Amino acid sequence: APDAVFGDRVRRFQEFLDTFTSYRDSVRSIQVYNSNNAANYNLNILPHRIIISLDDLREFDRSFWSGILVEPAYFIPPAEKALTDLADSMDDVPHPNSRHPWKLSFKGSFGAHALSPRTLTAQHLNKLVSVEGIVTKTSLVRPKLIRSVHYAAKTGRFHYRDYTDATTTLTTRIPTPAIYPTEDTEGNKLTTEYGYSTFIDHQRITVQEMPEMAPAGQLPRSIDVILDDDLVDKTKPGDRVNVVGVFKSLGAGGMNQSLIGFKTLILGNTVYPLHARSTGVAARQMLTDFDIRNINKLSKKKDIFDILSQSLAPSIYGHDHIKKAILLMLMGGVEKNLENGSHLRGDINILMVGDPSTAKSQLLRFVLNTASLAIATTGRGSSGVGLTAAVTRRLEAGAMVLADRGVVCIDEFDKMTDVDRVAIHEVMEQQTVTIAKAGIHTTLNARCSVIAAANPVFGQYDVNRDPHQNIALPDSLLSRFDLLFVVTDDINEIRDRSISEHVLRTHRYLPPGYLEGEPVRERLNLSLAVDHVFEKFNPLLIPKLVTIPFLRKYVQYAKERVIPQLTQEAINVIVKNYTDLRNDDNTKKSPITARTLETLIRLATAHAKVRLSKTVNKVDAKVAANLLRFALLGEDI
Amino acid sequence: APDAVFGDRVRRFQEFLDTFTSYRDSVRSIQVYNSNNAANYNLNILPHRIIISLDDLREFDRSFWSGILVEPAYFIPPAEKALTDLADSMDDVPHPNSRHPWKLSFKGSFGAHALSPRTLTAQHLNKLVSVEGIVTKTSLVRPKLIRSVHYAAKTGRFHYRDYTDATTTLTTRIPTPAIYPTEDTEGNKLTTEYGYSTFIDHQRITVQEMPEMAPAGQLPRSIDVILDDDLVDKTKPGDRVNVVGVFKSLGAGGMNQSLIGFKTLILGNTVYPLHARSTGVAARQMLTDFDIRNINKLSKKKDIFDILSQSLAPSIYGHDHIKKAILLMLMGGVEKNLENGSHLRGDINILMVGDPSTAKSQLLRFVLNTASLAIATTGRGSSGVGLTAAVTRRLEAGAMVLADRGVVCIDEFDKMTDVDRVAIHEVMEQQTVTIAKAGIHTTLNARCSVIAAANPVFGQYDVNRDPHQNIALPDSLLSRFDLLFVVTDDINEIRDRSISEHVLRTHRYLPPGYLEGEPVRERLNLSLAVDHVFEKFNPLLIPKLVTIPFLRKYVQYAKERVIPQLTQEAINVIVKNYTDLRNDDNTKKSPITARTLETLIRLATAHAKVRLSKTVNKVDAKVAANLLRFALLGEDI
Amino acid sequence: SAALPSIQLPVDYNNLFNEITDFLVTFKQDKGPKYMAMLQKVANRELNSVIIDLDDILQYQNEKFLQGTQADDLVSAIQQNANHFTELFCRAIDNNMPLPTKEIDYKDDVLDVILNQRRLRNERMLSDRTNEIRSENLMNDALREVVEDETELFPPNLTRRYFLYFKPLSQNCAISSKPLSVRQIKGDFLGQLITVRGIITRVSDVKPAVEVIAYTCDQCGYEVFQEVNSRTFTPLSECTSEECSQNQTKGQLFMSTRASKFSAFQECKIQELSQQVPVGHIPRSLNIHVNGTLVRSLSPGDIVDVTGIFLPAPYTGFKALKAGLLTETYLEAQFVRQHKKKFASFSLTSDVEERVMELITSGDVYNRLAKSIAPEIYGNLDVKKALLLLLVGGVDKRVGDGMKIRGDINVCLMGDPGVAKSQLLKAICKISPRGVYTTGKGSSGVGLTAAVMKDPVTDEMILEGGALVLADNGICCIDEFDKMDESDRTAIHEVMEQQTISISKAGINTTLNARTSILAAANPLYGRYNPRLSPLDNINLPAALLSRFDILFLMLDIPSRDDDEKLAEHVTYVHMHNKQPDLDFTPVEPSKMREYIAYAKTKRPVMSEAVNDYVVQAYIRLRQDSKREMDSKFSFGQATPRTLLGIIRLSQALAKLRLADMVDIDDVEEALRLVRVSKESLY
C-alpha cells in the first residue's frame, strides 16, 4: 500500500536530482553506453548505480541528508525509487531487447559516521556508516536465487516464483518462506528452467582494522560486509577498503524461542579500494585535459629526461644517474609475448651496492612512496614464503606476487638467504612463481621490477679490491639486475660542503601552512584508487623541478598510453654498444651476457617512453647505452 | 505478482468489449451522466456496473463464455479488470473532485445454470448460476468497513488500513486478520476518522423456491444471496427475483480443527425483480419511439376510448360500460395533496353485483392479468390481517398494502366479514392503514383502486325488489365504490344467440404456432420488471381492437406522462350533473353523496388521461357523467 | 493461480521438439543422414554416446533459411537453456530409434541385456492389456490409448543406453564456445551451455553415482524405481506399487544394484591460467561434474576448454553465513578440447597423414624440427637437436626376465648465465603435452614426491602426485638443478634410473610410477665456468648423477665479435617483430611438431647386427679414450655401460624421427656426433 511519506521523500529526492544536473548526465551516459554496445553486439555493461555526493545533498536539503545518514532504511529506498523513475523517464530510447531498479552509492564527508571496525559500536546500528579497514576474508561469489522459473509440460506453461531474504531490503518485511515450487497448483510436475531463473551475485567480505591504525599488541576488530550483484569482486584480501553501507542488525539474537546477541553486519552500498604504501592496490589518478596538455608540453622539451631525473629526489644530493635509472624503471620497457608462448621481460631491475649513508634506503623509500604500485621488503625480514607465494589447500600471495605489474623495494639485499635467492632468481627473469607444493601446481604472475640496496662485505667499498670480491653475491643473481650501481662515500671538500649545505637547506624547510615552531602533522595518506606543474621548494640552487604528484601523472600517462616500437636506427647503436661491451676489456663492475643486450633494449624503450615517442630513435639507444656504460664502468661520455 | 493467463484473459475481454460497441456506449453514458450532475451540484450517481449479454459473449468467444459460466473465479476478475481499464481509458474528462473498479453483471441464456433453490445442488458450486425464486428474508443493509482512516495527533499524520473478507473476491486469498489499528507503529494513540473511512453497503437476502413452481405439500428450499454496495435494497420480501451470481463455498465445513458441511451461498452479481401476477412487483415496460408514436397516433382518434374499451375483454360479450369503467380505473384520476396535509383520492373503485355467470370473475381475472400491479383476493379467503397490515415487533404488508399504487381485485365481496369491512372502509377513501397495535403505531400507504365482484342476497337479482335489499351491503361501504354496476342475466333471444356464437367463436381459436389438435402449452409468465398495434384475432365480427401488450403500453404512457388539469368548462358540466343527480328523484341504485361529485371529477380526469390531454375539457366531464348516470340508473343518453 | 503465477516466455517447446526431430531425421550434410547413422550404430551397440554438434544445428538452420523456411533458433535456445534440451533430444532420439540389426548374444554388456529384457517386457505388457481389453469386448486408436493409460511400463530413461552431449559450435563456424575464465563465469551465465578455458588441478576417482535406484518387492513382484537428485537419499522401506498401495499387507522391498541406474561420476577441478588472472590476484577454481562416457577425459595438469552446462547446486557452506537462497555452482561437462593432445591418443587419420607428408616432403625433417624448438633462441642447434631427441625419446625395452630398460633420454644443460637454458626449458614444456617446469629449492620438495590426503568427493585416502608424478610419461624440466635438497636429488636419481619413486614413510609404503624424461638446467660451480679448473671439478654433479644424464651440454658464453653481432641482430629483430629473423627457414607450428612427434613415438625401430657391431666398436673406443684421460683437464667422467645405452637410445630416437623401423648407420653416426659435440664448447 502506498505511503504518503514515501512519496513525499521520493518527490524531494526527485527535486534534488533535478537541481544537480550531474546525476541526469551520469544516468544518461550510463544508459547510452549500455544501449550502444547492446546494439553493437546485438565489452561490458555498466551497472545501474549512481555515486551521490552527500555534501551536495546537505547543501540542497539538510534533513534529507541527515535522514539518509541517520535513518537510511526510510530515506534510501525513496531516493532509489526517485532515481529509477528519473532513469525510466529519460529512457526514451530503450536498450535493445519501475523497471530496471537503480541503486545508490554515497560519497563525501560522513562526520561521526566515518568509522573503523573497532569504533563501530551498537549505537551505530541502522545508520549509514563509512568503515575503513583491511580486507582479510573474501567469500566465494555465490549466486542467490531471486526468481525461479519453472515449466509445466502437461499444460505447457511457464510459472515463476520470487524469493526474498532479510538482507535484500533495508526495511524489515514480514518473512514469507515460500517453498521451491516442485509442482503446479493442480498437481502437474514442474521442471526447473535454468537460464530463465534469476540469480544475483552475492559476496560476504570481512573488513578488519588496518594495521597502520590498529592498536599495537591488541586483537583486531572485524566487521562483515555483504555485496550484491555489482560490488562483488571489487576487492581482494589484503586490500585497504572503505565500505559505505547500512550497519544492519539481523535475526532475533536469541529472543525468538527455537544466539548470545544480535547478528550485525554492513549492507554494502559502496566499495572504494584505497591506496596505501606497500599494499597491493595501485594508484589510479585522474588526468584532466590540462594535465595531459602540460605533460605533452613538457615532453616536447629536449631535456625533459633531466627535468624528470632531478625532480625525483631533490632532497638527495647527486645520485643523478641513479635517479635516471629509477625513472626509467618507473617507465620500464615493453614486455614481449611471442605467439609460441615465450616471454621477454620488459621490467628494469636496479641494484645499489654502497657505503653506509649514501642514501640507498632514502632512494628506496622515495620509490616506495612515489611508485604507482610498490611493496617494501627487507632482507631476511621476508623469506621466500614472504616474498613468493605460500600454501595455506589455498594460496596466499607473497611480496613479489602482490607487486605484480609494480615495484619491489628490497633493502638489505645482501642479508638474504640462498633459499630466498633461488626464488628471486626465478622471479627476476621469467617473471613467474611456480609453487608445485602440497598438490598445488600453480604458476603465479610476478611481473615486477626489483630495486634493491646492499652493503659490501667489509661494510666499506674498498677501491683497491675488485667488485666481485666486494659484492659477495652470486654472479647469476647479479646478471638479472639490469643496472648495478656501486656508490662510494669519497670525502672530497667540494661535495662535502655542497652535500652539507643541501642537507641543511632541506632541514630548513617550512610547509606553506605552518608556523616557525609548529610540529608538522603527518597522516597515513589513504589515497582513493580511482595544481601547478613545477615545484616551489627547490633544495638545489639549475633546471626546473616538477612536483611529485605531477611526476606521477606523467609516469602514468607515459606508462599507459605509450608503447614504443624499436627501430633499425636504434638497433644499430644497440648492437654496436653490446658488441663493444662484450668484447672490450675494461674490468667491468658486472658481467656482460645476452641479458645486457636486453637491458640495452629495455632502457632504450623506457627512454622512448619518457619522451612520449611511439618509436625508439637513435638518441634513446645512445642514452640507454650511456647510462649502462656509466653503470658498468663509471664513464661520463 | 502478475499472471500471464490473467493478462491473456484481460486482453481477450478487451477485444470482446471493442467488438461490441454497446459496452463503450454504456460506460461512456454512465461516465458522462456522473460527471454532469457532479458538476451540476459541485440527483443520483449511477453505479459502475455494466450488463453483459452472455449470448454476445458466446458469439464472440465460446470458451470465454464457457469459462465465465463454469469457472467464474478465473474469468470474471480478468473481465472486470478489462472493463475498468477500458473505462479509465475513455475517462479523458474525469469527474470533478486501475481506479474506480467497474463490476460486471450478466444476462442472457444460462442453459443448465438457470436453476432454482431446489435444483441448485453441490455440483453447481463455483459456477455462475441464475436462480429464480421468492425473497423471504432481507437482512439489514449494514455498512462493512473496507478501509479505516486514523489520525495521529502527536505526529499529526493520517494513516489507513484496508480490510478484506472471504466474500469480497471470487478467488480465495490467504486470510490476513489485520487488527483494527488502535495505535501507531511507534506508540502514538490513533483517533478513528469517521467520514474518511470507507464503508460498503452489505445485505444478505434469502431466496426461496417460488410457490407457483415449488412442489405442493413439500418443505421449500432456500439459498442465501449476498449483495454489495449497489444490489442492496433492489428487492423486498415477497418479491419474485432472479439473482445471477457465483455459487460459492466458504469456510472449512468442520475440517479446520478448532460445521456439519461447507457454508454455501451466492455472491450476487445481478438482481432482476420479476413480475408475476398477484405479486407486489409492478410491470415496467420498454416504450420505444415507435410505440409512443403509435400511442399518440391512436390518441388523436376520436373514438379511441371505445377502441380501448372493446379491446379490453373481446372474449367477454357486452359489458361495454363496465369495460369503460375498468379502463378509466386503469388510468384513474390524479390524487391531490394539499399544503395543509389533506389528501383527495384519485383512485377509482368499481363494484359489480350480478347474477351467476355474467363474467364478473373473468372481468376480475382479466384486470389481474393486464394491470401494471394487481393483487387478487377472495372474500373470507383473506381477512383484515391478510388484506391490511399485520404485526409479526415487525410489520408484514397485507393484500392492500402490497397493492399500493395498484389494483385490488376482490372476488366474492359479499362473503366478507365486518371486521374486514371496517378496514376496507378505511382503505377505500383515506388510502391508509393505521395499525396502532402492540406498540406499533404506523400509517401504511394503501393508495389502491379496488375492483370487486359480488352476488345478490338470494343468488338472483330480483328486478321486482329494490337494489338496497338485493345488495345487503352497508350503505357507507357502497358509497366508497365509485361505480356500482348491477348486471342481470336476462334471457333474450337476440343476445342469447349472440353470446352463444361469441362463446363458440372464442372456443374455436388456434394460436399461430399450433396444430388443430395440439394441447396449448402454458407458462407462468415471469416477466422482467424493467409487434403490431392491433389484434389479428377478433371475437366480434366493428371497430378495431388493439393487442393487450399495446394496451398496457398505452395505459402506462397515459398513466405516467399525463396529469390532466380540471377546467371551468368541465366544472360547469360536473357541477350541473352532480346537482341534478343529488336533487332529481330517480330511485338510484346507489346513494348520492359528496363522494359522487368526486367520482365525477375522477372519471373526467381519467377520460382526459385516456385522450392524452393535459386539460379536462367539457367532453371528458360529459362522458364521465354519462357513465355515472348509466351506473346509477341504466340510461343510454 | 494467484500463487505460482504464469509468465509468457518466447520459448515454445512443441515446435522446438518438432525442429529437433526434423534435424535428427533429415540432416545429412556431414551416405544418408548423419544422426540416424549414429543412432543405428547405437542400436547395434557399437556406440554409447551421442554428441550433438551445435555446428550441425546451425548449418541446418542456415540451409532452412536459404530455402525460405522460417526455422526457430534451436542453437540459441540450447545455449540459453541447455538442461531442457538434453531431455528433449533424448526423447526425440527415442522416438526415431532404429531397430538393432544385431541380435543379443552372450558377449554383450549386462546393461544391454537388461535394457533389452525390460523393453520386451513392456511391449509384452502393452500387448497383454490389449488382449485383455479385447476379450472384455467393451476403434484401435481408443483401445491403444486405454492401454497406455492402464500400463505401468519401464520409462524411456530406464530403456536408455546412450549418453547425450552438446559439442559447442566452433568460433570459425559461428557464445557457448568462446572461452571464459573462472572469474568471468558469473551468475548470469547460470543454466547456459558455456566453455571455460583452464587447467585441471585435481581429478577424483570414477565412482558409481546412483541416478535411479531400483528395488524389488517379494509380495507383488514389482520393481519400484526411485530417482536420486541430491547428495544424499533416503531409501524406500515399504512398497509403493499399485498392488501393495491398494492392499493392506504392504511388502518390504529390497535394493537391486544390478537393476539400478548408475553413472560414472568424476568431480574435476579446473583453475584459471596465468594469462587469465588479473594483476595481483590469486587464481580461483571451478568444479566440473563429469558423467557418463565422458569420464577419464580430464587429468590433472591438462590445459583444456571444457564446455558444459553451468548449473547450481544446494548450498554447502556454513549455515550462519547463508543470506538468502545461496547456491553452489558446478559445470556439467559436455565436451572437452585438449590444447596439447597427448601422445598416447594419436591416431593416423587422413588429416594427420596429409600434414605429416607435407612435413616430410619439405625435406630436412630433423634439422627443421630441431631449429623450430624456440626459434627466437639463436645458435643452439646441437642443444635443440638433443632436446628434440628427448621429446621423441628412445625405445623402451622389456627383457623376458622381467628386466626393463628406460627408453627415455635425460638431458642436462650446465652453462654460464644468460645462455637461454631456462628459456629452452619453457620451450620444451610448451611443446610437451605433459611438461612440468620446476625450480630447485623453491616449493618442490613435496613436488618431487606425492602427498597423501583425503579425497573430498569420495571418502578415500589418495596420494596426489607432485612434479615427478604429474609429469609421468612426459618431461620434467628442472631449473637450478645444482640447488636442490638431498632427498630431492635421491628422488631424481631413482626416477632417472628405475622410473619409480619408492616411499616408505609414516603412513605410506608405495612404489610410484614416474616414467619421466628429466631435462635439467644447471649453473657451474661458482656460477661461471672457470676454464682453468677441471670440467668435473666445475661440475657439481656426483659421478652417479652425471652418469644418469644421456647427454650433458656445457653451454659456455665466450665473448666474440661475429657471434655476438649475430646474436644481437637476432634478439633485436625478435624485439622489433615478434618472430625470428630468418625468412628462408619457417618454424614448424608447435601443434604440428607435437603431431609429428606423436607419430614418431609410435615406431619401435630395432638394431641389426651391422649397426650394433659399430655401436660396440664405438663404445670400446670411447672407453679407451676415457681411460687415457682421467685427470687431463678435459676429463668428463670416464665412459660407462650407461653411455652405451645412451648411444643406443639416441640412435633409436633418431630412427624414430625418420619414421623408420631399421636403426641405420646414419642415426648412430649422429648420436655419436651429438655426444662428442656435447663437450666441444670447452675447447
Ligand SMILES: Nc1ncnc2c1ncn2[C@@H]1O[C@H](COP(=O)(O)OP(=O)(O)O)[C@@H](O)[C@H]1O
Ligand atoms: N648524498 C646524499 N644526499 C643527501 N642526503 C644524504 C646523502 N647521503 C646520505 N644522506 C642522508 O643520510 C641519511 C641516512 O641515509 P640512508 O638512506 O639511511 O643511508 P643508507 O643508504 O646507507 O642506509 C638520510 O637522512 C639522508 O638524507
Ligand SMILES: Nc1ncnc2c1ncn2[C@@H]1O[C@H](COP(=O)(O)OP(=O)(O)O)[C@@H](O)[C@H]1O
Ligand atoms: N357475457 C358473457 N360473455 C362471454 N362469456 C361469458 C359471459 N357471461 C359468462 N361468460 C362465461 O361464463 C363462464 C363463467 O363466468 P364467470 O366469470 O365465472 O361468472 P361469475 O361472474 O358469475 O363468477 C366463463 O367462461 C365466461 O367466459
Ligand SMILES: Nc1ncnc2c1ncn2[C@@H]1O[C@H](COP(=O)(O)OP(=O)(O)O)[C@@H](O)[C@H]1O
Ligand atoms: N642465444 C640466445 N638467443 C636468444 N636469446 C638469448 C640467447 N642467450 C640468452 N638469451 C636471452 O637471455 C635472457 C636470459 O636467459 P635465461 O634463459 O633466463 O638464462 P639462463 O638460462 O642462463 O638462466 C633471455 O631473455 C633470452 O632471450
Ligand SMILES: [Mg+2]
Ligand atoms: Mg640502508
Ligand SMILES: [Mg+2]
Ligand atoms: Mg364469480
Ligand SMILES: [Mg+2]
Ligand atoms: Mg635460468
Ligand SMILES: [Zn+2]
Ligand atoms: Zn510390492
